[PDB]
Design a protein around this nucleic acid. Structure first.
Ligand SMILES: [Mg+2]
Ligand SMILES: [Mg+2]
Ligand SMILES: [Mg+2]
Ligand SMILES: [Mg+2]
Ligand SMILES: [Mg+2]
Ligand SMILES: [Mg+2]
Ligand SMILES: [Mg+2]
Ligand SMILES: [Mg+2]
Ligand SMILES: [Mg+2]
Ligand SMILES: [Mg+2]
Ligand SMILES: [Mg+2]
Ligand SMILES: [Mg+2]
Ligand SMILES: [Mg+2]
Ligand SMILES: [Mg+2]
Ligand SMILES: [Mg+2]
Ligand SMILES: [Mg+2]
Ligand SMILES: [Mg+2]
Ligand SMILES: [Mg+2]
Ligand SMILES: [Mg+2]
Ligand SMILES: [Mg+2]
Ligand SMILES: [Zn+2]
Ligand SMILES: [Zn+2]
Lengths: 30, 33, 36, 49, 183
RNA sequence: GACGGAAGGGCACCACCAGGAGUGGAGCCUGCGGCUUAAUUUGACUCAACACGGGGAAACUCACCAGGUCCAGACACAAUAAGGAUUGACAGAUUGAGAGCUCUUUCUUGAUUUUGUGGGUGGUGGUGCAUGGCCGUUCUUAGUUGGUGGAGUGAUUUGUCUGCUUAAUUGCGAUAACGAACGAGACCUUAACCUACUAAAUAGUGGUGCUAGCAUUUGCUGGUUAUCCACUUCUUAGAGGGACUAUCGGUUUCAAGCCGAUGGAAGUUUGAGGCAAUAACAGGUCUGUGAUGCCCUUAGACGUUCUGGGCCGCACGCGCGCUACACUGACGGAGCCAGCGAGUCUAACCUUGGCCGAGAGGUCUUGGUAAUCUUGUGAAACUCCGUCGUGCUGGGGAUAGAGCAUUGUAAUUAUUGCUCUUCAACGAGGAAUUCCUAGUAAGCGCAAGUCAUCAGCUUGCGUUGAUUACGUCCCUGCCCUUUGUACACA
């Protein structure tokens, strides 16, 4: 089967200061 | 008696007589001796 | 802040709900049970 | 002592906080983003690229 | 669904350990799999804790009447030891004294917070060989971090260990640098 | 050591060149100040504040204010307990109120809690200058240490370096060093190719018992959701293969290597990322945490709630932006091309397909827990065929009026949409300034997050696809040496 990645793009910081850096976690099913 | 329905819904969270632990909003009220 | 005052002591309505300690209100027209 | 609060953000609360802030209603988990990455890897959500 | 499902495999798998280093910590918890440090006080007074909350596992979680080479076990191994009271100077070298000749490559322990109320102590205690980093760390480390609540200023540990890649016990057999032949 | 406005080197499109694409000039969107305010909650102010705290706020959120409920002050001592403590109460005056807030009234529920001492204890209340954690920046950087030996009484130094070279303390080389470990690299994810083994009405293609139509000696184009037969080339992806700069030139010095060429699926580390050393900094967050020290507070509450308003309020400056100024354009048929992706059990999510409708939308089923249905998401730029011949004219859609819907207890200060009239600058933007080297820039629209609702936002995505350099310190910055110091709080 084709696998579908589950992606949750959330910004890396709790507050709203820094550079606007994001990061995508994956869930890889099969 | 409003209080009396819960007393054996079981078998004053303070004086011990049941220890409390939170973990997400619906109250794991688990018992003493 | 209320008193429900002490009553230098003392009809009736229906339903085994209202249990004979339910003497209806001494006003006028009153068919009222202090229970509810 | 209550009035219609059926939908919206006052409705949904964080599992770990009841924090109405930062909700992520994706994949039926319902946690805020401050909150999630702390509890991230233990769900099998990892980082590859 | 199936997406909203395999998440719920894990997001149910998750809140458990929120409920585990809260209730079984003093009773010696290591990790769900139930990995543990101490293991009687998990059962209870021959029955006091075994079922005190399996009976609450249901009447909270929708059920019915009837259905030292790890850091997360070593970052609380002796997190008690601090809030009970010892020197934070030699006690920390003890644990990296401990695991290191347990055939283990590398270990590192830090304590962060107010030793004395200032811009706050952050001293660090290492010993050994700690690969970091790339992909070979996910394989070879364990690190835990537990907030320590003492009466004047919260502090916090960041323990790290590493598996001896030689006596690996699973997966790769040595560092991906590995070189050797015979003369 | 750190620092210098001292000297060498070395390096970067948060530096420049050669050029590309834009903003600051206009309307409007949004965020910041201001200002106004009962309140306009607030954090952040250089790169590293200002479409940033998911911060797209109508209630909520809500922290703000004008008001109004509540005990959800456990419990320990001490008081009304069994000659009723005490909560509740329908309606009425009150009040926003179908609020017993409260007043009258007399009912009334029943050792449940009413009161002070004491103790709690909730807090988006204060202190990111008491903290955890995490995060951001130096750093889109090459650095860092120890063993034995050498040098020093010593702190220290050597190793860790002239010179090349590399993206790099990457290596050749040189060497009082030698041999090492961390960092870079290796490692891991993804976009490509395999005519190969391993493969299927959930994928895609021929083909058959046969079926639809133009020509008609057998082809055109199909149709056949429980009608048969085939295939692994596409797809997808299990196991693996393959790129090693391989080979041969151009220049090397002895090489380390850099500029060509062929092979070619693949020549900037093959492309794009994930990780990440030794140390930092009063950096940001108590407005994420049942993380929180200590204080402030705890019954006319700063707790929680109900009602209503506010964060968006405009002589103004600024930041991320969207629609453009039109003839490579706009209007109009119409050809019709994606890829990335999400979706409903105590339930209303993805809506085909019907049918009403001017559209918005209505209504009606239906498939879909999902390679099956929505979905070939029949996207847009596009583009083929027409149209309007350069005014501010339709370019432009701003302000502004009238009418129909959709969400929602609740759209008024237009949530949002569709229709008709309105038709404001703006005529390519000053000083400045950004981003950028290949499937890149740029244009285009599409999903997902947000979401009851709402994009001019975000994270991604594919369609279309250039110019130009494949270089240097001239500026701005950073790293290594040398040097000076009365700095070490550096
Ligand atoms: Mg809250
Ligand atoms: Mg690496
Ligand atoms: Mg230029
Ligand atoms: Mg402010
Ligand atoms: Mg504050
Ligand atoms: Mg500042
Ligand atoms: Mg910077
Ligand atoms: Mg309110
Ligand atoms: Mg609140
Ligand atoms: Mg602050
Ligand atoms: Mg020596
Ligand atoms: Mg000596
Ligand atoms: Mg040295
Ligand atoms: Mg700080
Ligand atoms: Mg705002
Ligand atoms: Mg501006
Ligand atoms: Mg529909
Ligand atoms: Mg207009
Ligand atoms: Mg935004
Ligand atoms: Mg220069
Ligand atoms: Zn009655
Ligand atoms: Zn949370």
């Amino acid at each position: 089967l084709p696998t579908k990645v589950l992606k949750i793009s959330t910004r890396k910081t709790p507050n709203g200061e820094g550079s606007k850096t994001w990061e995508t976690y994956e869930m890889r099913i099969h | 008696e409003d209080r009396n329905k819960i007393h054996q819904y079981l078998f004053l969270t303070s004086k011990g007589y049941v220890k409390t632990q939170f973990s997400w909003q619906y109250y794991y009220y688990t018992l003493t001796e | 802040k209320h008193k429900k005052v002490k009553l230098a002591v003392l009809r009736e309505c229906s339903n085994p709900t209202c249990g004979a300690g339910v003497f209806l209100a001494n006003h006028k027209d009153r068919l009222y049970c202090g229970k509810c | 002592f209550s009035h219609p609060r059926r939908y919206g953000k006052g409705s949904r609360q964080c599992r770990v906080c009841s924090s109405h802030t930062g909700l992520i209603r994706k994949y039926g988990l319902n946690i805020c983003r401050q909150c999630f990455r702390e509890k991230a890897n233990d769900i099998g959500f990892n980082k590859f690229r | 669904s199936k997406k909203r499902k395999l998440v719920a495999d894990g997001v149910f798998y998750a809140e458990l350990n929120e409920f585990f280093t809260r209730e079984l910590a003093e009773e010696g918890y290591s990790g769900v799999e139930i990995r543990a440090t101490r293991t009687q006080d998990v059962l209870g007074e021959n029955g006091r804790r075994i079922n005190e909350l399996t009976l609450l596992v249901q009447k909270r979680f929708k059920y019915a009447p009837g259905t030292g080479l790890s850091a997360v076990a070593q970052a609380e191994s002796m997190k008690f030891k601090l809030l009970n009271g010892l020197a934070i100077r030699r006690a920390a070298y003890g644990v990296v004294r401990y695991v290191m000749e347990s055939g283990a490559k590398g270990c590192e322990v830090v304590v962060s917070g107010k030793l004395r109320a200032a811009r706050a102590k952050a001293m660090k205690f290492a010993d050994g060989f700690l690969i970091h980093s790339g992909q070979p760390v996910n394989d070879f480390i364990d690190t835990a971090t537990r907030h320590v609540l003492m009466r004047q200023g919260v502090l916090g540990i960041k323990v790290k260990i590493m598996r001896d890649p030689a006596k690996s016990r699973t997966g790769p057999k040595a560092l991906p640098d590995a070189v050797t032949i015979i003369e």
